[PDB]
Design an enzyme around this catalytic site. Structure first.
Site, mmCIF file in Angstrom:
data_model
loop_
_atom_site.group_PDB
_atom_site.id
_atom_site.type_symbol
_atom_site.label_atom_id
_atom_site.label_comp_id
_atom_site.label_asym_id
_atom_site.label_seq_id
_atom_site.Cartn_x
_atom_site.Cartn_y
_atom_site.Cartn_z
ATOM 1 N N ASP A 1 85.214 32.187 48.624
ATOM 2 C CA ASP A 1 86.257 33.207 48.750
ATOM 3 C C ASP A 1 87.632 32.585 49.015
ATOM 4 O O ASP A 1 87.803 31.711 49.906
ATOM 5 C CB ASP A 1 85.902 34.208 49.861
ATOM 6 N N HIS B 1 96.535 37.844 49.124
ATOM 7 C CA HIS B 1 96.299 37.745 47.686
ATOM 8 C C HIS B 1 96.117 39.176 47.171
ATOM 9 O O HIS B 1 95.936 40.118 47.979
ATOM 10 C CB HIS B 1 95.014 36.933 47.412
ATOM 11 N N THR C 1 88.847 40.716 46.431
ATOM 12 C CA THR C 1 87.511 40.122 46.467
ATOM 13 C C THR C 1 86.457 40.901 45.658
ATOM 14 O O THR C 1 85.772 40.329 44.805
ATOM 15 C CB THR C 1 87.003 39.938 47.915
HETATM 16 O O1 YNX Z 1 77.731 38.649 49.963
HETATM 17 C C1 YNX Z 1 78.824 38.830 49.435
HETATM 18 C C2 YNX Z 1 79.054 38.386 48.014
HETATM 19 C C3 YNX Z 1 78.163 37.615 47.434
HETATM 20 C C4 YNX Z 1 78.269 37.491 45.936
HETATM 21 C C5 YNX Z 1 77.911 36.310 45.316
HETATM 22 C C6 YNX Z 1 77.989 36.197 43.901
HETATM 23 C C7 YNX Z 1 78.453 37.311 43.158
HETATM 24 O O2 YNX Z 1 78.542 37.258 41.734
HETATM 25 C C8 YNX Z 1 78.624 36.014 41.134
HETATM 26 F F1 YNX Z 1 77.662 35.236 41.564
HETATM 27 F F2 YNX Z 1 78.506 36.119 39.806
HETATM 28 F F3 YNX Z 1 79.792 35.538 41.541
HETATM 29 C C9 YNX Z 1 78.803 38.486 43.787
HETATM 30 C C10 YNX Z 1 78.719 38.603 45.198
HETATM 31 N N1 YNX Z 1 79.913 39.435 50.122
HETATM 32 C C11 YNX Z 1 81.200 39.609 49.511
HETATM 33 C C12 YNX Z 1 82.015 40.319 50.581
HETATM 34 C C13 YNX Z 1 83.435 39.964 50.924
HETATM 35 N N2 YNX Z 1 83.477 40.378 52.312
HETATM 36 C C14 YNX Z 1 84.634 40.486 53.172
HETATM 37 O O3 YNX Z 1 84.442 40.842 54.300
HETATM 38 C C15 YNX Z 1 86.034 40.117 52.753
HETATM 39 C C16 YNX Z 1 86.269 38.794 52.294
HETATM 40 C C17 YNX Z 1 87.528 38.379 51.930
HETATM 41 C C18 YNX Z 1 88.626 39.328 52.037
HETATM 42 N N3 YNX Z 1 89.971 39.185 51.756
HETATM 43 N N4 YNX Z 1 90.576 40.378 52.021
HETATM 44 N N5 YNX Z 1 89.607 41.259 52.483
HETATM 45 C C19 YNX Z 1 88.407 40.602 52.489
HETATM 46 C C20 YNX Z 1 87.078 41.024 52.874
HETATM 47 C C21 YNX Z 1 82.163 40.697 52.778
HETATM 48 C C22 YNX Z 1 81.390 39.832 51.806
HETATM 49 C C23 YNX Z 1 79.918 39.939 51.483
HETATM 50 ZN ZN ZN Z 2 88.097 37.178 48.094
HETATM 51 ZN ZN ZN Z 3 91.184 37.661 51.423
#
Ligand code: YNX
Ligand code: ZN
Ligand code: ZN
Ligand SMILES: *[C@@H]1O[C@H](CO)[C@@H](O[C@@H]2O[C@H](CO)[C@@H](O[C@@H]3O[C@H](CO)[C@@H](O)[C@H](O)[C@@H]3O)[C@H](O)[C@H]2NC(C)=O)[C@H](O)[C@H]1NC(C)=O
Ligand code: CA
Ligand code: CA
Length: 805
Positions: free
Chosen positions: A121, A420, A159
């Protein structure tokens, strides 16, 4: 309700999901607050940490430990990743020289090389070079496998849109996740980072890789991880899954890190605090690769190291407030931040007007750090309009800035130094791609490409048939050693008519006039040859574009240009012409200013007429082949043919004329000749796709002359600019635009100035891929070149971004 009194005994990180009220033991049970009572104890062990030490080697198995250093650990598949290094005198994967992987080297019972996606990320593209000293594992992946200098994310560069684009090959307008936060007017429901509405399957469209795999008989690890699960445990779980029996073992996996995004928000993309999280990520990569080595899979597995978007310097003080612009600020709902989306606060409020909002947001302050758009006027490259979840009004925010509704939103919600979400062609938003393994090339650099292309490749890597998506299958074949997908050109659907001279002048009643009665076997034979196609090889360099839908059209030949003229739309679908480095610009002579000429090859009934432009006080006309670039005073007459004319608002003509008179010659000088293909686009429903005849919302007044929403140009030359565009032996070089056909220049705040100070800036904002144009016109370009088809596909996906290094 969850009956948490069931047990995770022998189910830690199970792959199939159990529905309520049964307690779960999968990697997402925490996010649902549904884990069994003993999940932490059994599944999230931390005793003694994550590394073997000298004194643990050959220890008595103790099932309380987070990982193991006893002799049975390899058969069990649960050693600490550094086990063999510490206990068996083996080296870390990073300390081994890299050695080409010419064929997969996999343990028996592996049907196919597994794919592991390692997603990071907020991993800004320039981190690969700038942080390379503290990232030895990632640097080895990068230098030994296949890498791009950067990967282009989708807009908005948030994201959820980007991770879901990665997984599906789709634009966010198609897959439905158009932001981190959303309101869907049909559901009447909101999507949020915080809470349970986001787990509802209705939000998530298309077919992500794990579903594509499962449906075609390929098992997938679950891609998502609850935040509280440490990275070390994520990695040990993937490694454990990989030692399952052949029938139970998945073939595709994902790891996900919240870093370096999390720290980048706090400290800025390059804050000195950013070293640590880059080091830690590298350590995690090293753990996986050491773990693969132990299992003998380090020369079997394809690894993708990939990010979702970059990170820019943004702080609280750099915020624009809608309250300094609007009288009615309390009548709107704003989705704020690095992008703005605006809708009415209440649907019951009939004094709400987008027109007045837009205008009150237009060029109001000298330094204004955002620009408002009706979504259908957004640059077509962003592909961000065709979804009810995207609000009609959008604000494009300058890099480094925010938009908020009122100051109190910002200090009563600095707390941050990075963010971003900005325009996806912005350098700071670019991200990473590295592929390493048997199926990827060895020490190979590829050009930057778009993340929408990866789904096809991930499918190829797994032998899967991709669901329909926005990638161009084959355009990334140059990343791959083997498993390429060898596409064929689409078949042409409509064949052209080739009309000769069929009508006398007096048959035309178009209200046009031209001073051309100013009147020879020498040149007459010669100019007949021109009408028959004698110069076509000069001006039509890569064959005629194919028409991929059912329609009726004519090919028309001229000394200086060639066109495919639609009898249905009454204007060319495309106009093709070549301008050499030596070509010279001339003026439109006085006696020809208002000259329009009937085309005796085309019936009156299938022609435009000048009367409709006289009557339409809003609408003027331009020409697709520019009279400024006629090869001779005699050839210039062709450029005034009614079949070369297109409808143009006077304000848009300021743009078009400057492109034709000044910029084409400039590009020809700089690039050693250029070949140009120009034409109209009709996308009244803003779907990125060509409109049919019964979808046109605007005509020139009184007539059946349809008004384009956009004008495109495709500008091709030789990549080896020491060769002229018309005598090029090898690869091509292209830049294109899709210019919105607007009745005002409100988009350009400096437009009262001279075209030299604002027109090129507009065209750069509206840069496009040839592929974008193909979707919008139903044409298929570059059909006859000496280049391989995959190379042409790559060229067709190229976007000229005019961003610096
Ligand atoms: O477990 C996953 C994804 C796994 C995955 C792997 C491959 C994937 O597809 C691929 F493999 F093809 F890439 C898709 C999902 N997540 C993604 C979510 C983001 N998140 C945030 O709290 C967050 C983070 C940055 C931020 N910036 N601003 N606000 C923000 C909020 C909770 C995380 C749980
Ligand atoms: Zn992100
Ligand atoms: Zn972010
Ligand atoms: C990006 O890729 C997607 C997937 O091919 C394209 O979206 C697809 O576009 C077509 C035409 O708008 C949709 O077909 C329609 O399907 C429904 C049935 O579900 C039917 O009611 C209509 O008559 C029509 O057949 C299709 O649903 C849609 N699929 C998805 C997943 O969004 C999209 O056009 C591509 N975008 C560009 C700019 O090329
Ligand atoms: Ca359309
Ligand atoms: Ca203006």
């Amino acid at each position: 309700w969850t009956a948490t009194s069931g047990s995770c005994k022998g189910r830690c990180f199970e792959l199939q999901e159990v529905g309520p009220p049964d307690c779960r033991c999968d990697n997402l049970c925490k996010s649902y607050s549904s884990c069994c009572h003993d999940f932490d104890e059994l599944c999230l062990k931390t005793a003694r940490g994550w590394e073997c030490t000298k004194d643990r080697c050959g220890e008595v198995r103790n099932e309380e430990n987070a990982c193991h250093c006893s002799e049975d650990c390899l058969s069990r598949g649960d050693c600490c990743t550094n086990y063999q290094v510490v206990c068996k005198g083996e080296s870390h994967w990073v300390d081994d020289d890299c050695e080409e992987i010419k064929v997969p080297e996999c343990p028996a019972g592996f049907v196919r090389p597994p794919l592991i996606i390692f997603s990071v990320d907020g991993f800004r593209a320039s981190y690969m070079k700038k942080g390379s000293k503290v990232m030895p594992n990632i640097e080895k992946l990068r230098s030994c496998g296949t890498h791009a200098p950067y990967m282009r994310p989708v807009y908005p560069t948030k994201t959820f849109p980007n991770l879901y684009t990665l997984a599906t090959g789709l634009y966010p307008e198609s897959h439905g996740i158009v932001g981190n936060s959303m309101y869907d007017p049909v559901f009447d429901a909101s999507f949020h980072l915080r809470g349970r509405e986001k787990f509802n399957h209705r939000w998530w469209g298309g077919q992500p890789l794990w579903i594509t795999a499962t449906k075609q008989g390929v098992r997938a690890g679950t891609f998502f991880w609850s935040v509280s699960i440490p990275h070390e445990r994520r990695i040990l779980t993937i490694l454990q899954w990989l030692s399952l029996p052949d029938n139970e073992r998945p073939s595709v996996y994902a790891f996900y890190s919240e870093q370096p995004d999390f720290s980048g928000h706090k400290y800025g993309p390059f804050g000195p605090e950013m070293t640590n999280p880059l080091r830690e990520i590298d350590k995690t990569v090293g753990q996986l690769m050491d773990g693969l080595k132990q299992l003998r899979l380090h020369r079997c597995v394809n690894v993708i190291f990939v990010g979702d978007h970059g990170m820019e310097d943004v702080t609280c003080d750099r915020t624009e407030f809608l309250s300094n612009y609007l009288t009615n600020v309390d009548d709107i709902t704003l989705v704020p931040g690095t992008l703005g989306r605006i809708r009415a606060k209440s649907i019951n409020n009939s004094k709400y007007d987008p027109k007045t909002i837009i205008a009150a947001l237009t060029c109001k302050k000298p330094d204004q750090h955002f620009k408002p758009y009706m979504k259908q006027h957004l640059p077509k490259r962003l592909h961000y309009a065709n979804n009810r979840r995207i609000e009609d009004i959008h604000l494009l925010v300058d890099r480094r800035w925010h938009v908020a509704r009122k100051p109190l939103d910002v200090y009563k919600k600095c707390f941050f130094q990075g963010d971003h979400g900005f325009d996806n062609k912005v350098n700071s938003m670019q991200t990473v791609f590295v592929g390493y393994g048997p199926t990827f090339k060895y020490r190979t650099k590829v050009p930057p490409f778009e993340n929408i292309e990866l789904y096809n490749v991930m499918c190829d890597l797994l032998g899967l048939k991709p669901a329909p998506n926005n990638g161009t299958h084959g355009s990334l074949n140059h990343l791959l050693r083997t498993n390429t997908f060898r596409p064929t050109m689409p078949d042409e659907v409509s064949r052209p008519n080739y009309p000769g001279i069929m009508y006398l002048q007096s048959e035309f009643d178009l209200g046009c006039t031209c001073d051309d009665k100013v009147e020879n076997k020498l040149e007459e034979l010669n100019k007949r040859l021109h009408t028959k196609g004698s110069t076509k090889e000069r001006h039509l360099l890569y064959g005629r574009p194919a028409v991929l839908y059912r329609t009726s059209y004519d090919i028309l030949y001229h000394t200086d240009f060639e066109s495919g003229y639609s009898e249905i739309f009454l204007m060319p679908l495309w106009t093709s012409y070549t301008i050499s480095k030596q070509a010279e610009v001339s003026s439109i002579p006085e006696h020809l200013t208002n000259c329009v000429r009937p085309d005796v090859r085309v019936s009156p009934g299938f022609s435009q007429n000048c009367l409709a432009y006289k009557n339409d006080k809003q609408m003027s006309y331009g020409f697709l082949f520019p009279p400024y670039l006629s090869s001779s005073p005699e050839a210039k007459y062709d450029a005034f043919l009614v079949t070369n004319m297109v409808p143009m608002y006077p304000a848009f003509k300021r743009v078009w004329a400057y492109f034709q008179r000044v910029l084409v010659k400039k590009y020809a000088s700089e690039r050693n000749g250029v070949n140009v293909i120009s034409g109209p686009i009709f996308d009244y429903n803003y779907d990125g796709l060509r409109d049919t005849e019964d979808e046109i919302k605007q005509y020139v007044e009184g007539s059946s002359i349809p008004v384009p929403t956009h004008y495109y140009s495709i500008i091709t030359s030789c990549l080896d600019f020491t060769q002229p565009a018309d005598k090029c032996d090898g690869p091509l070089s292209v830049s294109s635009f899709i210019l919105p056909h607007r009745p005002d220049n409100d988009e350009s705040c400096n437009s009262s100035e001279d075209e030299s100070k604002w027109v090129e800036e507009l065209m750069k904002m509206h840069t496009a891929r040839v592929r974008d144009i193909e979707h919008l016109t139903g044409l298929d370009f570059y059909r006859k070149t000496s280049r391989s088809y995959s190379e042409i596909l790559t060229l067709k996906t190229y976007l000229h971004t005019y961003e610096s290094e």
